[PDB]
Design a protein around this ligand. Structure first.
Ligand SMILES: *[C@@](O)(CNC(=O)[C@H](CC(C)C)NC(=O)c1ccncc1)CNS(=O)(=O)c1ccc(Oc2ccccc2)cc1
Length: 215
């Protein structure tokens, strides 16, 4: 095989979810990194709580938006995060009600990849596991995706607006790609996932806002 890795096979990825009518795409992306590690450093994968981050991370906007690094700082400074079953996802802002009894994971910090360095991202993905990324998902060609390696020249690396999780990488039919997991339910794209162009000058700004937590 060539240089390629798919973590879904491995077991580091949790089933696809839907954010709904809440811009909590960031809470979903941080939770995914958190799970990748929890598997890697435990052996058992478990569903972590996006709702928990949505309500308690005051440094962010709730369903209004938020960064992922800001999500990690909270898990640390709080010392634990809930599991889904413990803190259900209602897709809406409400009171932060963290149940320490159901604390399912924790981290001790994080690390951003060099702004724009695709190779630095690829290494992180291969040596760390799923990384949290932020791309330009405004283009309709992105939204109506069903198959193939997406690439749109009019995509803007300066319009970081949608946060997702890079699950792996590899080639297709002479096409390099970043295996991306979205949070719009398993009805969008290829069962929730989309293959984005890899090595095409950092398309849609894939490497402009990456990070992963340390556990
Ligand atoms: C996400 O909902 C909220 N996104 C953000 O907060 C992003 C992510 C990180 C990187 C902070 N903010 C930024 O990317 C940003 C970074 C750097 N500089 C400026 C800004 C929104 N993304 S979306 O693709 O527009 C979107 C997502 C969900 C949605 O709701 C649905 C859910 C399910 C089905 C249908 C719709 C609508 C739009």
């Amino acid at each position: 095989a060539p240089d390629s890795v798919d973590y879904r096979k491995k077991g580091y990825v949790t089933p696809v979810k839907n954010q709904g009518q809440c811009g909590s795409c960031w809470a979903f992306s941080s939770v995914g990194a958190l799970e990748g590690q929890l598997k890697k450093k435990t052996g058992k994968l478990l569903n972590l709580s996006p709702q928990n981050l949505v309500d308690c991370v005051s440094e962010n906007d709730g369903c209004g938006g938020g960064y992922m690094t800001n999500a990690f700082q909270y898990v640390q400074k709080n010392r634990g995060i809930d599991s889904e079953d413990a803190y259900p996802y209602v897709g809406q802002e409400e009171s932060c009600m963290y149940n320490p009894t159901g604390k399912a994971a924790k981290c001790r910090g994080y690390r951003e990849i060099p702004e724009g360095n695709e190779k630095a991202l690829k290494r992180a993905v291969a040596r760390v596991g799923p990384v949290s990324v932020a791309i330009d998902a405004s283009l309709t060609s992105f939204q109506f995706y069903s198959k193939g390696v997406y690439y749109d020249e009019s995509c803007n690396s300066d319009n970081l607006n949608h946060a997702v999780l890079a699950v792996g990488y590899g080639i297709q039919k002479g096409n390099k790609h970043w295996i991306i997991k979205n949070s719009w339910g398993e009805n969008w794209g290829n069962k929730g996932y989309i293959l984005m162009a890899r090595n095409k000058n950092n398309a849609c700004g894939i490497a402009n806002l990456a990070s992963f937590p340390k556990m």
